Design a protein around this ligand. Structure first.
Ligand SMILES: CCCCCCCCCCCCCCCCCC(=O)OC[C@H](COP(=O)([O-])OCC(O)COP(=O)([O-])OC[C@@H](COC(=O)CCCCCCCCCCCCCCCCC)OC(=O)CCCCCCCCCCCCCCCCC)OC(=O)CCCCCCCCCCCCCCCCC
Ligand SMILES: CCCCCCCCCCCCCCCC(=O)OC[C@H]1O[C@H](O[C@@H]2[C@H](O)[C@@H](O)[C@H](O)[C@@H](O[C@H]3O[C@H](CO)[C@@H](O)[C@H](O)[C@@H]3O)[C@@H]2OP(=O)(O)OC[C@@H](COC(=O)CCCCCCCC[C@H](C)CCCCCCCCCCC)OC(=O)CCCCCCCCCC)[C@@H](O)[C@@H](O)[C@@H]1O
Ligand SMILES: CCCCCCCCCCCCCCCCCC(=O)OC[C@H](COP(=O)(O)OCCN)OC(=O)CCCCCCCCCCCCCCCCC
Ligand SMILES: CCCCCCCCCCCCCCCCCC(=O)OC[C@H](COP(=O)(O)OCCN)OC(=O)CCCCCCCCCCCCCCCCC
Ligand SMILES: CCCCCCCCCCCCCCCCCC(=O)OC[C@H](COP(=O)(O)OCCN)OC(=O)CCCCCCCCCCCCCCCCC
Ligand SMILES: CCCCCCCCCCCCCCCCCC(=O)OC[C@H](COP(=O)(O)OCCN)OC(=O)CCCCCCCCCCCCCCCCC
Ligand SMILES: CCCCCCCCCCCCCCCCCC(=O)OC[C@H](CO)OC(=O)CCCCCCCCCCCCCCCCC
Ligand SMILES: CCCCCCCCCCCCCCCCCC(=O)OC[C@H](CO)OC(=O)CCCCCCCCCCCCCCCCC
Ligand SMILES: CCCCCCCCCCCCCCCCCC(=O)OC[C@H](CO)OC(=O)CCCCCCCCCCCCCCCCC
Ligand code: HEC
Ligand code: HEC
Ligand SMILES: *C(=O)CCCCCCCCCCCCCCC
Ligand code: CUA
Ligand SMILES: [Mn+2]
Lengths: 51, 154, 24, 51, 233, 143, 331
């Protein structure tokens, strides 16, 4: 109960503030099936003070 | 209880990125003061000076400075009573007209950026031939064209 | 009946100023 | 009195046969906002409990 | 055109808005704020939805019947936009004010379900806290509330997100990009216009509705059945 | 009930007269403090008002013409002429308050314009008026 | 009424707080008022005296201490007296109605040959004045002056129908404003400034009223007159023009809103300033030549104070007025 993700800062990790994009998996289909993929997808992205 | 002498609506302020200075009593007001720094590089000061002096003294905006940095603002003629001097960077004044009715005057302006930070605040001095105003103002980006700009992975 | 580590800051906010370095 | 009891029994037959008819032959699969037959999908469970 | 539009806007402003916002749109101390720099979007949202003119100060101005036509609204928006710009309206590719085309980023005749699936998560993170899942409304502090999202058209949803009306936060197009806003619109209009499959929605409020329904009228009808079958002596 | 039926013709004649006068006057007369034209609210209002007093006067007269000479309509009646039954009167009823509560629920539903409140209030109202009107007739329990 | 009141302190009591009136028809109404109060005070005095006689003469202890007995004379009817006491009120109110019709017909006439016509617009919550007509004798240049701003009046005229087809009110748009008046010379009131309508002395004037939204009322207590200003006055059959034969004397006169119109109803004041005929010609010439100049500057130009004096704008702050000082001053 003392810790969260932000505790990683005390381990000398750079921790950005990530905003949520809500991006969902993509369905790719072809001659051998259909599959949901998240390979190029990112749920979080860095942000900047001008946003 | 909410219709009292202190109400929620009567307290509210303009949902805009700039600050304001001047009361019901002050002769010359400034509205929506903000240092607009583009994400490309251009910078300037956005504001609207409003003359409401009841002695009918015109006020000429002589100079504007931002954290001691001088502002280039194109030539403006004086602000008579119930006139308004609008100012922004030229790229953003090209997106609106200049009315023939009433008394409004558009003047472009620009700064040489010393390296201001987005999100921060800097002191801005307006100097008129009659007097002066000082006001804190946030550094911000200008607004986008509504509904055209998607974000991308990069 | 109040948290003993939840005081107002004695020092007031000084209206500080920020900047960023740059190539030019 | 006999006619009174017969009435509700006959209507129970109608209700039960309506249930089986609905549960079998009414179209029941999910339809989205743009589809044709969104009405027929939304009235399925209603009809099930009505019958 | 635009100067005739600004003339019409100034004349309407002078007999409807000038007491609370001043002759130079500077604001009057405790009557209304400054309109310098609000944009055409703020005037469109406020006038077209009916929120302006306010006619008594309270905790919150409410949506009511509009006082001005849409053309008159755009005239006033032109005139206000001349006093320092601001965010503007979302026009479509031909030049008409955008409406049903905002129903998702990939709109083409009908709403696509991927847009609804992403806009559901966006709405549930950024909006539902105040407007409840699927936008039925919510109560804020001291007589304030988040309205019901039924009455708003797509342009009004977009300009609400841009302008931050009253106690609503602002969501610039750098915060929520255009596509994320359009997917939020798609989600609002999907849920606002899809009947529940399981019968009557009971207002979609949540458990208090079904509670009241059962724990009053549901037990009442079975008490009536018990009184039909049993004795009152 | 002669005098009661007959005194409803004073206001009937008067209100009809004022109706026709007001109508002609508002359509023909001109003064600098009003625009000429027939004023429809006062027209309809006065003629329907004369209709109300006509309605009561005519019904009460048409009843009076076939009621007997009652002791309360007689100048030298003895107190023992009305001896006997006078009529049935409700001794008690919970349903008036019930009806007021039903109308209250309906009115608050109309205020907020919640549809379920309007439905429930109308249901309550028909129920409570029905129970009022069935009070002195409910069967004995047959068990 | 033609007859003047008694005058002096008796007249001051009789007119019971009414202003003296700055028009001829205000004088007529004030006369009629003072005389009807002579009548009213007679009635009130004699009937209060009867109610005192009841206290001090018709008592039961006074009657018993002089041996009148248990009961009085049980009189109940006196057909002649209860006829006379009914017929006398009738012949009283008939004379009252005669004088009423005389005064009302003089005040309410629309044949006074107006030389200056002002278009008045009320809105929530202030006034807008504009000169519709100024006949030549005092006009700018000498030619009979019409005030309409054709472009702006045409925009208001085109707002009579919605291009998107939402035209529910007898074919017209709900937000129709084609009944409102738009002139070149206008004075527009604000929270910060009282609108001062400048008018000339000894000139017949016409006022043309209307409202932008909600009913208002145009009460100048020095005219002893008010009329309601309505939105769409012709759909309501409300006569929107009234005329005064002259203002007799110059000065600054307050005017107020006298029909409930909402929150700031009590803050909707205007000033009616009355100046010389030639001074008014100068004022209108100045305003017509340089239409960018304001109302205060023209007032200064003809040698009057720039801002209203009979009234002042209110402090808009919702709490600052708490300790008495609710008025904000001007230069
Ligand atoms: C669908 C929509 C819903 C409506 C449809 C109808 C639903 C009812 C049907 C289900 C039951 C079926 C069985 C049946 O037939 O039962 C009949 C049963 C009674 O049968 P009964 O044999 O005719 O009883 C009479 C005997 O003489 C009684 O003989 P007794 O003397 O032995 O018994 C006396 C009995 C008699 O009282 C009752 O039985 C119920 C009293 C109802 C009146 C309540 C006060 C209303 C004030 C307003 O009272 C009591 O026992 C005392 C209880 C307290 C009474 C109220 C006191 C006031 C403060 C609380 O009826 C009820 O009990 C129904 C009562 C409903 C009242 C009407 C609705 C009022 C609305 C609420 C007010 C809310 C405020 C509004 C304003 C603000 C809004 C925002
Ligand atoms: C029959 C009932 C009739 C009720 C009367 C209706 C009118 C109510 C009224 O007169 O309110 C005055 C105003 O109160 C509120 O501001 C209060 C001060 O004025 C103001 O200077 C302060 O700045 C406010 O400061 C607070 O607010 C800030 C926001 O700015 C916050 O930073 C923070 O909250 C801060 O503290 C302050 O607020 P409180 O909440 O502290 O005090 C409320 C209360 C206090 O009065 C008293 O003790 C008087 C005692 C006598 C009571 C009996 O006032 C009232 O009810 C007083 C009037 C009641 C008299 C009615 C007759 C009695 C019959 C009823 C029993 C505000 O709501 C205005 O809208 C409103 O006009
Ligand atoms: C009795 C059964 C009633 C029933 O099934 O209710 C109708 C149902 C309710 O749908 P609804 O609650 O309006 O969902 C809106 C959620 N956004 O769905 C509807 O309202 C549609 C009902 C159509 C019935 C006519 C066709 C047969
Ligand atoms: C026969 C059917 C009648 C009964 C239906 C009950 C369900 C109520 C309902 O429909 O709720 C949704 C409704 C939304 O309103 P609607 O009527 O759809 O109209 C549009 C709004 N102007 O919502 C409303 O109008 C308001 C409903 C909210 C009720 C109060 C909620 C807070 C307090 C509840 C406490 C818990 C419940 C206690 C009840 C039992 C107590 C023993
Ligand atoms: C058993 C329950 C049956 C309910 C009636 C069926 C139905 O579909 O009702 C329609 C209507 C709800 O429709 P709606 O316009 O969505 O109400 C406002 C929502 N807040 O229903 C109502 O508003 C009243 C329902 C009671
Ligand atoms: C009871 C007495 C009713 C008799 C009414 C007396 C007047 C009748 C003749 C008046 C006349 O000339 O009518 C014209 C007037 C409309 O005015 P306008 O069309 O301008 O007049 C010139 C056209 N010949 O005509 C009218 O509009 C006359 C209408 C008079 C008022 C009617 C009031 C009652 C109508 C509804 C009754 C209730 C229905 C349920
Ligand atoms: C509940 C009825 C009164 C509502 C007053 C109100 O809506 O007032 C609104 C307004 C805010 O109240 C105020 O400013 C005054 C705050 C309250 C002042 C004390 C109230 C007296 C307590 C009476 C108890 C009665 C018990 C029976
Ligand atoms: C019957 C139902 C009873 C349910 C239990 C309620 C216990 C409350 C005790 C609070 C003690 C506390 O945490 O007290 C400590 C706390 C600090 O006290 C304070 O904040 C000071 C104020 C405390 C006032 C409490 C109420 C007093 C009257 C009973
Ligand atoms: C007690 C009656 C007092 C009548 C005052 C008449 C003054 C002279 C007049 O006529 O002066 C002329 C003036 C008109 O009369 C008026 O206003 C007089 C208005 C009142 C008329 C009362 C008539 C009673 C019979
Ligand atoms: C006083 C009675 C008002 C009049 C008349 C008008 N408005 Fe207003 N407005 C008023 C308040 C108190 C507020 C604050 C927010 C709230 O809802 O209470 C506003 C706000 C606006 C806005 C939004 C400004 C922003 O920060 O985004 C706009 C665009 C606006 N008002 C416009 C407007 C117009 C065009 C009016 C005449 C038709 C008008 N308002 C009347 C109070 C009052
Ligand atoms: C609580 C802090 C809110 C959050 C988070 C969001 N909104 Fe909101 N919204 C809120 C309020 C208090 C109001 C009323 C504003 C007013 O001036 O009336 C609103 C209003 C809207 C509207 C307008 C609806 C209408 O009646 O026309 C819309 C369309 C709306 N809000 C949408 C919306 C969305 C999509 C949000 C997430 C991005 C969102 N709001 C956040 C309060 C709050
Ligand atoms: C907040 O300002 C709301 C309005 C406050 C008005 C104050 C005056 C209240 C007077 C007494 C009201 C009694 C109401 C009784 C309710 C049952
Ligand atoms: Cu008004
Ligand atoms: Mn009135």
């Amino acid at each position: 109960l003392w810790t969260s993700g932000w505790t990683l800062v005390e381990n000398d990790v750079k921790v950005y503030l990530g905003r949520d994009t809500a991006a969902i998996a993509e369905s790719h289909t072809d001659a051998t099936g259909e599959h949901w993929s998240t390979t190029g997808v990112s749920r979080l992205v860095r942000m900047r003070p001008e946003d | 209880c909410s219709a009292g002498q202190i109400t929620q609506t009567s307290s509210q302020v303009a949902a805009v990125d700039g600050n304001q200075a001047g009361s019901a009593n002050d002769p010359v007001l400034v509205r929506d003061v903000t240092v607009h720094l583009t994400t490309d590089g251009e910078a300037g000061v956005k504001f609207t000076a409003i003359n409401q002096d009841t002695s009918h003294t015109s006020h000429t905006l002589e100079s504007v400075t931002v954290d001691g940095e001088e502002v280039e603002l194109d030539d403006a003629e004086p602000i008579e009573r119930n006139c308004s001097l609008v100012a922004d960077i030229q790229s953003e004044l090209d997106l609106i007209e200049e009315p023939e009715v009433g008394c409004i005057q558009h003047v472009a302006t620009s700064l040489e950026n010393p390296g201001f930070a987005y999100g921060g605040v800097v002191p801005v001095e307006f100097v008129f031939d009659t007097g002066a105003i000082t006001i804190d103002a946030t550094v911000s980006a200008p607004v986008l064209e509504s509904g055209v700009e998607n974000r991308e992975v990069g | 009946c109040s948290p003993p580590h939840q005081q107002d800051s004695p020092v007031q906010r000084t209206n500080e100023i920020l900047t960023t370095s740059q190539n030019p | 009195a006999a006619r009174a009891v017969t009435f509700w029994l006959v209507l129970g037959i109608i209700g039960g046969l309506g249930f089986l008819a609905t549960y079998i032959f009414w179209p029941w699969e999910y339809k989205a906002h743009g589809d044709e037959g969104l009405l027929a999908y939304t009235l399925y469970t209603p009809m099930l409990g009505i019958t | 055109d635009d100067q005739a539009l600004i003339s019409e806007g100034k004349d309407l402003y002078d007999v409807a808005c000038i007491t609370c916002h001043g002759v130079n749109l500077q604001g009057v101390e405790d009557r209304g704020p400054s309109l310098v720099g609000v944009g055409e979007g703020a005037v469109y949202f406020q006038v077209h939805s009916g929120r302006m003119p306010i006619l008594r100060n309270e905790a919150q101005a409410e949506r009511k019947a509009p006082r001005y036509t849409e053309a008159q609204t755009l005239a006033i928006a032109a005139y206000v936009a001349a006093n320092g710009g601001g965010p503007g309206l979302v026009y479509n590719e031909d030049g008409t004010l955008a409406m049903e085309e905002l129903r998702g980023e990939n709109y083409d005749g009908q709403i696509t379900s991927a847009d609804v699936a992403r806009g559901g998560d966006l709405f549930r993170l950024n909006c539902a806290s105040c407007h409840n899942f699927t936008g039925r409304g919510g109560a804020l502090s001291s007589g304030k509330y988040a309205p019901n999202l039924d009455a708003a058209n797509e342009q009004e949803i977009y300009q609400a997100m841009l302008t931050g009306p009253q106690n609503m936060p602002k969501f610039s197009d750098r915060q929520l990009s255009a596509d994320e806003k359009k997917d939020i619109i798609a989600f609002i209009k999907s849920t606002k216009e899809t009947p529940s499959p399981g019968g009557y929605s009971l207002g979609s409020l949540g458990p208090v509705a079904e509670g009241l329904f059962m724990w009053v009228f549901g037990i009442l009808v079975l008490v009536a059945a018990a009184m039909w079958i049993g004795s009152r002596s | 009930m002669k005098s009661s039926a007959k005194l409803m013709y004073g206001p009937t004649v008067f209100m009809a007269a004022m109706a026709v006068i007001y109508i002609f006057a508002t359509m023909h007369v001109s003064d600098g403090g009003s625009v000429k034209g027939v004023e429809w609210v006062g027209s309809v209002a006065l003629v329907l008002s004369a209709g109300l007093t006509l309605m009561l006067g005519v019904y009460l007269h048409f009843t009076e013409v076939r009621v007997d000479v009652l002791p309360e309509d007689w100048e030298e009646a003895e107190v023992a002429d009305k001896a006997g039954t006078l009529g049935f009167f409700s001794p008690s009823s919970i349903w008036p308050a019930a009806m007021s509560g039903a109308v209250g629920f309906l009115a608050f539903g109309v205020v907020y314009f919640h549809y379920w409140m309007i439905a429930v209030g109308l249901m309550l109202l028909i129920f409570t008026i029905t129970k009022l009107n069935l009070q002195y007739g409910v069967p004995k329990e047959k068990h | 009424c033609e007859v003047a009141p008694p005058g002096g302190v008796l007249g001051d009591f009789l007119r019971m707080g009414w202003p003296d009136g700055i028009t001829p028809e205000a004088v007529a109404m004030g006369n009629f008022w003072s005389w009807v109060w002579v009548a009213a005070w007679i009635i009130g005095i004699i009937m209060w005296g009867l109610f005192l006689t009841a206290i001090f003469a018709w008592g039961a202890k006074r009657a018993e201490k002089r041996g009148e007995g248990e009961f009085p004379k049980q009189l109940q009817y006196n057909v002649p007296l209860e006829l006379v006491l009914t017929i006398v009120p009738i012949i009283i109110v008939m004379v009252l109605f005669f004088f009423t019709v005389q005064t009302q017909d003089k005040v309410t006439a629309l044949d006074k040959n107006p030389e200056v016509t002002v278009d008045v617009t009320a809105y929530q919550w202030n006034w807008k004045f504009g000169y519709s007509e100024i006949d030549g004798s005092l006009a700018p240049g000498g030619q009979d002056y019409q005030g309409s701003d054709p472009e702006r009046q045409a925009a208001a005229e085109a707002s009579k129908k919605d291009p998107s087809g939402d035209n529910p009110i007898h074919g017209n748009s709900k937000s129709d404003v084609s009944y409102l008046e738009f002139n070149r010379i206008e004075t527009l009131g604000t929270t910060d400034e009282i609108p001062v309508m400048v008018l000339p002395v000894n000139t017949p004037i016409e006022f043309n009223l209307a409202s932008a939204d909600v009913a208002h009322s145009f009460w100048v207590p020095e005219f002893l007159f008010k009329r309601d200003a309505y939105a769409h006055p012709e759909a309501n059959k409300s006569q929107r023009v009234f005329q005064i034969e002259e203002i007799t004397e110059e000065g600054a006169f307050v005017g107020r809103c006298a029909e409930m119109c909402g929150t700031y109803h009590a803050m909707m004041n205007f000033e009616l300033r009355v100046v010389d005929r030639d001074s008014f010609a100068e004022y209108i010439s100045f305003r017509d030549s340089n239409p960018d100049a304001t109302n205060a500057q023209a007032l200064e130009h003809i040698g009057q104070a720039p801002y209203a004096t009979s009234t002042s704008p209110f402090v808009s702050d919702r709490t600052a007025t708490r300790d008495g000082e609710n008025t904000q001053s001007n230069a």
